[PDB]
Amino acid sequence: GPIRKVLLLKEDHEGLGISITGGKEHGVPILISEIHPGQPADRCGGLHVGDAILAVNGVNLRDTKHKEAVTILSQQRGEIEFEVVYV
């Protein structure tokens, strides 16, 4: 599919509402494995199971190890832009 920029709005008291898997140590991109009901990703739409996360708020997640990506993603607050692709 196309590379997509997707808006997600996250208050500080809540998570992103996604689970991720994969990462450089496994030879695959950071992939969305789950979208959790009623949380920001679910509410906003636009993100799907199987999407690869290429970047978040301009921060490159390509070639990032699972833990690195967890750290970066978990630091984002407020209006968050995801760059994803379903490939």
Binding site: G15, L16, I18, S19, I20, T21, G23, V28, H66, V70
Partner: peptide
């Protein structure tokens, strides 16, 4: 769930 997963 082939690899480790993290909820965010």
């Amino acid at each position: 769930s082939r690899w480790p997963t993290t909820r965010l």
